[PDB]
Each structure stands twice: as structure tokens, then as C-alpha cells.
Amino acid sequence: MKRAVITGLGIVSSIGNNQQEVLASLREGRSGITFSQELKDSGMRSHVWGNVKLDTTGLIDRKVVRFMSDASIYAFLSMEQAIADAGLSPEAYQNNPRVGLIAGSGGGSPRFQVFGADAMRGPRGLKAVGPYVVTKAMASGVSACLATPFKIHGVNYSISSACATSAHCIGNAVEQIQLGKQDIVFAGGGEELCWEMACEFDAMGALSTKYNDTPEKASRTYDAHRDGFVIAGGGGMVVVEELEHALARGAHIYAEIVGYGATSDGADMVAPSGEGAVRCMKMAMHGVDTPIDYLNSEGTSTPVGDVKELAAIREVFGDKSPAISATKAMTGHSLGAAGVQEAIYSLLMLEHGFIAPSINIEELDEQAAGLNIVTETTDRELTTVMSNSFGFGGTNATLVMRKLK
Amino acid sequence: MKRAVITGLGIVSSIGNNQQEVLASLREGRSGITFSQELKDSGMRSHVWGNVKLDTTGLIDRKVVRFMSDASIYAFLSMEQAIADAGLSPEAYQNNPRVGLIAGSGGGSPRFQVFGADAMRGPRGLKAVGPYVVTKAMASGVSACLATPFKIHGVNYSISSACATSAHCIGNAVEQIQLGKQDIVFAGGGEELCWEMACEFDAMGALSTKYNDTPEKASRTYDAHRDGFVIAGGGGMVVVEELEHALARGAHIYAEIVGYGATSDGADMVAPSGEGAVRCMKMAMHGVDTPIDYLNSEGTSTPVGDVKELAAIREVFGDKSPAISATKAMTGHSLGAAGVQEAIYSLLMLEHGFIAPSINIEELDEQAAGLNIVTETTDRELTTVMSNSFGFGGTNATLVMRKLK
Ligand SMILES: *C(=O)CCCCCCCCCCC
Numbered sequence: 001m002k003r004a005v006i007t008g009l010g011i012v013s014s015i016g017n018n019q020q021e022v023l024a025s026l027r028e029g030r031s032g033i034t035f036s037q038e039l040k041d042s043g044m045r046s047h048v049w050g051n052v053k054l055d056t057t058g059l060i061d062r063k064v065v066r067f068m069s070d071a072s073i074y075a076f077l078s079m080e081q082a083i084a085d086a087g088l089s090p091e092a093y094q095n096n097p098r099v100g101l102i103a104g105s106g107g108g109s110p111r112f113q114v115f116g117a118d119a120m121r122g123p124r125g126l127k128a129v130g131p132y133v134v135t136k137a138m139a140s141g142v143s144a145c146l147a148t149p150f151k152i153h154g155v156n157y158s159i160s161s162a163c164a165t166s167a168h169c170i171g172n173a174v175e176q177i178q179l180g181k182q183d184i185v186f187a188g189g190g191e192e193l194c195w196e197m198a199c200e201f202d203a204m205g206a207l208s209t210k211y212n213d214t215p216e217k218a219s220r221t222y223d224a225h226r227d228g229f230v231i232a233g234g235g236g237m238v239v240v241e242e243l244e245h246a247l248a249r250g251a252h253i254y255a256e257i258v259g260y261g262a263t264s265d266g267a268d269m270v271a272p273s274g275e276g277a278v279r280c281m282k283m284a285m286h287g288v289d290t291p292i293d294y295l296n297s298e299g300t301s302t303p304v305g306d307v308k309e310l311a312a313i314r315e316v317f318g319d320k321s322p323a324i325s326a327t328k329a330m331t332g333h334s335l336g337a338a339g340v341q342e343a344i345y346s347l348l349m350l351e352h353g354f355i356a357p358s359i360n361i362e363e364l365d366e367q368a369a370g371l372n373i374v375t376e377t378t379d380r381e382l383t384t385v386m387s388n389s390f391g392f393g394g395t396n397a398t399l400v401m402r403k404l405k
Numbered sequence: 406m407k408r409a410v411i412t413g414l415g416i417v418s419s420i421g422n423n424q425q426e427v428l429a430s431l432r433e434g435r436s437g438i439t440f441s442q443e444l445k446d447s448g449m450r451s452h453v454w455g456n457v458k459l460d461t462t463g464l465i466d467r468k469v470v471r472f473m474s475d476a477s478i479y480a481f482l483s484m485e486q487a488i489a490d491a492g493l494s495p496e497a498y499q500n501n502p503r504v505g506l507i508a509g510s511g512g513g514s515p516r517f518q519v520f521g522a523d524a525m526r527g528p529r530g531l532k533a534v535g536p537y538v539v540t541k542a543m544a545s546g547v548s549a550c551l552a553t554p555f556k557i558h559g560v561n562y563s564i565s566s567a568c569a570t571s572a573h574c575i576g577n578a579v580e581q582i583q584l585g586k587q588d589i590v591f592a593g594g595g596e597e598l599c600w601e602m603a604c605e606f607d608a609m610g611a612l613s614t615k616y617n618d619t620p621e622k623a624s625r626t627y628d629a630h631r632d633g634f635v636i637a638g639g640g641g642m643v644v645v646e647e648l649e650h651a652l653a654r655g656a657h658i659y660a661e662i663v664g665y666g667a668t669s670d671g672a673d674m675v676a677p678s679g680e681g682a683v684r685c686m687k688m689a690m691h692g693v694d695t696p697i698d699y700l701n702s703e704g705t706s707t708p709v710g711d712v713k714e715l716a717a718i719r720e721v722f723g724d725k726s727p728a729i730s731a732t733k734a735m736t737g738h739s740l741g742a743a744g745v746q747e748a749i750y751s752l753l754m755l756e757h758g759f760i761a762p763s764i765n766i767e768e769l770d771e772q773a774a775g776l777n778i779v780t781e782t783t784d785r786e787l788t789t790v791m792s793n794s795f796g797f798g799g800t801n802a803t804l805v806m807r808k809l810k
């Protein structure tokens with residue numbers, strides 16, 4: 001069937017507002033985590049986060065941004081970048097039935113859902129709520145707020161799957177190409193950063209709380225003293241395009257998506273089973289006869305999660321353990337946006353020939369012994385890379401990207 | 406490619422807690438709309454809704470329901486019904502890599518999102534919030550909360566697209582079968598009903614507010630005196646299965662999904678363009694050699710929406726107009742769950758050979774000129790039915806179902 005390639009990327013993350021800033025951060029192992037007075041003032045135990053360092057004010061037309069929440073704003077800016085990077089003119093992707101968009105978020109906008117409820121209970125009621133809360137709070141906000149302004153005429157919807165969200169968006173975009181239904185599909189996601197959402201994770205003990213005095217060291221995937229993930233926000237978008245279509249217009253191709261896995265654990269609501277991830281990676285590797293040169297793990301920096309994933313990796317590769325690094329150690333967990341941002345970090349490593357370090361490992365977990373966990377920036381000619389995304393509800397997604405000749 | 410059929414269904418709506426109660430309501434043209442003290446007390450102008458009349462207490466095991474919000478609860482009950490109706494047992498669908506689930510909601514859980522923030526802001530903080538809010542508030546709540554307890558091992562994620570949500574879930578399930586990736590996929594969705602979410606629509610002016618004294622007459626699609634939709638809650642689930650697999654086990658087949666359309670308006674954020682709807686219906690009709698006998702339109706019961714759809718239908722069919730009925734006139738708008746519930750209402754009409762009536766039409770709109778709008782339960786031998794679902798962000802979905810030869 002049809003082949004799908006990535007011809008453009010865009011990103012707004014805690015470690016950079018474009019692919020160049022991100023490239024630099026990755027090579028330097030630079031942390032994007034900072035102290036958050038907002039989280040502390042909210043009464044949380046976790047006082048750190050991967051915030052987007054950028055004032056989005058005035059970057060989007062007023063009549064457009066009025067319907068958007070932060071998730072949508074980050075994704076929108078990422079898409080603008082992706083379009084430019086892919087070299088697509090308005091006439092090339094706009095008002096085109098064969099051009100679609102699949103992008104989502106993990107929780108829509110808790111901030112605006114809370115805003116509406118707070119306003120409604122106030123002295124003004126409906127007048128305080130305003131007529132723009134629905135498009136900001138609905139789960140499809142990220143896709144609705146981008147499809148409309150970018151004049152998308154093809155597929156238009158969001159895939160939501162907790163922390164695997166934007167990973168499934170990319171995979172579904174590949175499926176549209178494979179089914180011959182679309183020539184181009186913009187795929188990615190976004191996630192806002194706020195105490196309204198973060199506190200829920202702290203209430204279940206999922207966030208790091210013992211490193212508030214040293215923010216850049218809180219996220220420490222694979223470290224014996226890890227104590228939870230560091231929440232983050234941001235966005236990402238990639239241009240998934242049919243191969244022949246990309247070649248015909250002389251598009252720059254980062255890589256082909258040669259493998260996409262999507263499975264379910266059918267076990268625990270918030271803890272990974274490991275068994276599902278094994279099937280997910282194996283599914284993504286079906287027909288891929290080239291070895292995996294680098295694996296961008298889920299590496300949440302949680303006690304149980306990091307362990308279950310290393311076990312799954314051992315089962316899949318055994319004595320064929322590939323190089324591994326967890327970028328979340330420096331970026332934090334952007335939840336719904338993690339999938340696309342991590343695929344982008346992987347594409348950058350593949351494009352520039354290097355492996356980003358898995359930082360903050362002062363004492364390697366005993367269950368990670370024997371694995372090839374890269375802890376220092378290492379230059380290397382990569383050809384095939386893998387990126388895993390796992391979320392609550394036992395949802396698993398894996399993407400395999402490979403350079404073209 | 407492979408063919409997909411519906412071998413089972415389950416539903417929990419304002420007009421019935423199962424397919425029998427729904428069938429009884431559709432035949433009688435009974436309304437599920439009632440006066441809501443909750444909405445009135447919140448300060449809203451709309452005082453009516455299509456609530457689920459069912460005491461869900463004790464219907465789901467304690468350990469499982471503790472992670473669920475109302476949208477998940479409704480979808481869960483619908484899935485239990487669908488499994489039994491399909492004649493499937495644990496040994497056949499559990500722990501099976503070729504059995505998946507695609508189901509979502511329009512906005513996760515505004516109630517628990519607000520509950521979390523309210524609790525956190527209280528003197529107890531994190532202790533008051535509890536450790537179960539994430540799975541209740543996240544957008545993928547519906548898929549996560551069903552795939553886990555039902556031990557699903559295949560595909561697992563939610564698709565969100567506002568009022569087209571559950572319609573795209575079904576379409577995506579069909580795609581999994583066509584790609585040969587799954588033999589069975591449970592598809593559908595659910596949506597909670599609460600002022601927290603309802604007030605956002607009211608502040609938007611999208612809800613009916615001139616018939617609070619006569620609830621059952623508030624939702625009046627195509628009526629010249631319509632003034633917005635009536636919000637509703639509920640769930641729905643259908644079993645999408647590969648044809649040979651279904652025939653091999655001697656399953657009961659309601660109909661085959663012979664058409665699926667998914668397009669984008671790329672125009673207005675909250676108003677339909679019509680142009681997108683035309684392309685969507687045409688896409689679903691492509692290849693169908695049989696004419697459309699019945700059409701379960703979107704019929705939101707809104708001034709602009711109704712007009713735009715009628716025009717689109719007129720553009721697609723023209724003189725050869727099929728029987729048209731807007732079930733939302735009696736059920737209300739269940740948003741994220743509207744797609745699957747309407748697909749179900751249509752399957753029941755096709756299964757029981759009859760057309761549901763479009764109630765509350767005291768004065769037909771000028772736009773519905775040369776169109777066959779059924780306003781009374783009519784017995785007919787339907788063969789091919791169509792259902793349209795449109796949502797904010799200009800997202801369109803259309804499903805075409807036909808009896809198996
Ligand atoms: C990743 O799997 C962890 C869960 C992320 C879900 C997306 C964010 C939902 C938060 C909603 C408010 C509690």
C-alpha cells in the first residue's frame with residue numbers, strides 16, 4: 001500500500017520554541033523545567049513544571065484566537081512552523097479535500113471548564129461566561145481550532161488517549177494515507193499547563209515532589225531516586241504526506257513512518273502492564289528488517305512505569321538492546337503533546353545524526369543494568385528510530401521512523 | 406478490502422435504557438425532555454434537558470466505577486448490552502489482540518474537572534480531590550474506562566470531534582476492519598449531563614430557552630419557531646465486526662457499513678458551512694448502488710444549523726429526496742454520544758422496518774420546501790439508511806448502513 005513520510009515539523013516545547021532551539025537543547029542536555037509559584041500557591045506538593053517560555057499574545061489573529069485555549073494556541077503555532085518547514089503554500093493545502101488534520105489534547109482545557117463554572121456561579125452568571133468557552137473546553141478544541149482557520153477540507157477530528165494522544169494522531173494520519181483517503185494530514189497535539197489540571201495528578205501521587213529546590217533535577221528517568229513525573233505543556237505538529245506526492249513536489253523528507261503500533265493492556269487503569277507495550281513495539285516492528293538504532297522511551301520518571309517499560313524493551317529486543325534515552329528527563333511530560341514532541345525529537349536526532357542524553361541519572365536503577373542507556377550526547381549515524389507513548393487506561397502507541405535513501 | 410458489519414448494539418438514552426425501551430419511544434414518538442431544576446438553580450435560561458432516567462447505583466462493581474465519570478458509566482452499560490446482544494462471551498473478546506475499542510466523549514467530564522478544582526481550593530486540598538479524578542476528567546475517559554475492565558487488547562483510544570464524536574469512532578472502527586488490523590471493534594461513546602457543561606452552551610445562546618414551561622416541545626427541529634437545541638446525556642455502543650468473522654460464528658447482522666464520510670468545512674468555528682456536509686454525504690454515498698431510503702439528519706433544532714443542512718441535503722439529492730427525520734426532536738442533543746445513538750436509532754428503524762417521526766413541527770421551515778420530512782411513524786421496508794453528524798470546528802461525519810444481501 002501507500003507509504004507515508006514526514007515532510008515538515010513544528011514545535012513549541014519547554015526546551016524550545018522552534019526546531020532550532022530544540023536541537024540546541026537536546027545536544028546540550030538542557031533542562032526545560034523551572035520552579036512554579038503557581039503550583040505552589042495552589043497548594044500542591046509538586047512545585048516544578050516544563051513551561052513554554054513564550055508570550056503568545058498577538059501571535060494569532062484576534063478573531064481566531066478568541067475561540068482557543070492554550071492547547072490550541074501551542075498546536076496552532078506548531079502547525080504554522082510545520083507548514084513553512086514543509087514548503088506548503090496556501091493554495092497547496094487550503095480548501096483541498098485530500099488534505100486533513102488529526103490532532104488532539106489529553107484533557108481539553110481544565111482551566112476554561114473551571115472558568116465557566118466559576119463565572120456561572122458569580123454575580124454576573126452567563127454574562128461572565130461569554131460565548132467562547134465551548135470551543136476552548138471541548139476535547140476536540142485542538143483540531144477544531146486549527147482545521148477552521150487553516151481552511152482544512154479533508155479529515156478533521158482529534159484522537160484522545162491520555163499520554164499516547166498525539167502518538168495515535170500521527171499513526172491515524174498514516175492510516176489515512178495508507179487507505180488512500182488523503183495526500184497530506186497534519187498530525188500532532190497540544191496541552192495547556194495549569195494547576196487546575198496538575199493538582200489532579202498530584203492528588204494521585206503521580207508528580208515529583210522531593211526536588212522542588214532543584215527543579216532541573218526533578219525529572220530523572222531511570223534514576224534509583226526518581227519520584228514521579230514533572231508536568232509540562234506545549235505543542236507539536238508534523239506533516240504526514242504520501243510518498244509519491246512528496247517526491248513530486250520536491251519536498252524535504254525527514255523519514256518514512258515504517259511502523260505504527262497501537263494496543264491495549266486491558267489490565268490496570270493507571271499502571272502499565274508491560275505486556276501491552278511488548279505487543280505494541282512488536283506490531284510497529286512488523287516488516288521492519290532494519291535494526292532499531294535509537295529508542296526514545298516513554299520514560300515518565302515514575303517508579304513503576306520506568307521499570308515496566310525497560311522490561312518490555314528487554315522482552316522485545318533481548319540481546320539486541322538498542323541505544324536508549326528518555327527526553328522527558330529534560331523536557332518534562334507534556335501529556336497529550338508528548339507523542340508528537342518526542343517523535344519530533346527523534347526525527348531531529350535522525351536528521352542530525354546524534355543521540356540526546358538521558359540526564360539526571362546519578363544512580364542507575366538496578367533493573368536497568370545491561371541496557372544501553374545513553375547519558376551523554378553521542379554523535380552517530382542513525383537510520384531507524386523508535387518512540388514509545390503509553391497512557392492511563394492501558395493505551396499504547398509506538399512509532400518507527402526510518403531514513404530514506 | 407474487508408467488509409464491516411454491526412453485530413450488536415447497546416444504548417442508554419433519554420428515551421430508553423435499552424434498545425427495547427428506545428424502540429418503544431421511537432414508535433410512539435415520545436419525548437425524553439423534562440424540566441431540570443438543576444439547570445434552573447444554576448442560573449441558566451434553558452431549563453430543560455434529555456436526562457437518563459436510570460438509577461445506575463450498583464450496576465457497576467465498586468472497584469471499577471470508582472475511576473469513572475457519567476460519560477464512562479453510560480458507555481459502559483451500553484457496552485455490556487452490546488456484548489450480550491452480539492452473543493459474545495469473555496473467551497471470544499477478552500485478552501484478544503484482534504478485538505479493540507474506539508469510543509469517546511465530547512468534553513470528558515466538566516463535573517469532575519470542576520469538582521477537582523473546587524475540592525483543591527478547599528482546606529483539605531489534595532486530600533479532598535482524591536486519587537480518581539484524572540481518569541474521570543481526561544478526554545479519553547470513555548475508552549480508558551471500558552477497555553481496561555473489559556480486558557481489551559487491541560486498539561484502544563477515543564476520537565473526539567464535538568457533536569460528530571461517536572460517529573467518527575464508528576467510522577474509524579470500520580477502517581480498522583478494512584485495514585485487516587482488527588476482527589472486532591466496539592465503537593460508540595457517552596456524555597454526562599450537568600449544569601457545569603450546559604451553562605457554557607447557554608452563555609453561547611445555543612440552547613432553547615422559550616419553552617421551559619412545555620419541556621417536551623422545546624426541541625422542535627425544522628419548526629419555524631425553533632430557538633436552539635436541548636442538551637442531553639447518555640451513551641451508545643455498537644459491535645463493528647469483519648464480515649467473514651461474523652458469518653463464521655453465525656452472528657446476527659443488523660447491517661453492513663457500506664459508507665463512511667469524514668470531511669472538514671474550514672470555515673466557521675460554530676456554524677455549519679453546508680459545503681462540507683455536501684462533500685461528506687457524497688463521500689459516504691460513493692459506491693453505494695442502492696438509493697438512500699431514510700436519512701437521520703443532524704437536525705440540531707437551531708435556526709442556522711437546520712437551514713444549512715436542509716440546503717446541503719437538497720444539493721445532494723434534490724428532487725430524489727429520501728425520507729427525512731430528526732430524532733433529536735424527541736431525544737435532545739447528547740453531543741458526543743449523539744453519533745452512535747443516532748446510528749442505533751437508524752439501525753432499529755432499518756431492523757424493524759419503520760421511520761421515526763419528526764415531532765414538534767407546528768410550522769415547517771421555508772428551507773424544507775421540496776423535502777420529504779416524515780412527521781408521523783411510518784411503516785416502510787427500508788434497505789439503506791444514512792445518518793449525519795456535524796460538530797463545532799466544521800467537523801463532518803456521515804454513515805451509510807445497509808441490510809446484508
Ligand atoms: C498519561 O497517561 C497520564 C494521564 C494524562 C491524561 C491527559 C490529561 C487529563 C487531565 C484532566 C484533568 C484531571
Ligand SMILES: *C(=O)CCCCCCCCCCC
Nearest residue numbers: 137138511512567568796797
Ligand atoms: C456540537 O458540535 C456542539 C459542541 C459540543 C462540544 C462537546 C461537548 C463538550 C463541550 C465542552 C464542555 C466543557
Ligand SMILES: [N+]
Nearest residue numbers: 296297342388
Ligand atoms: N517516546
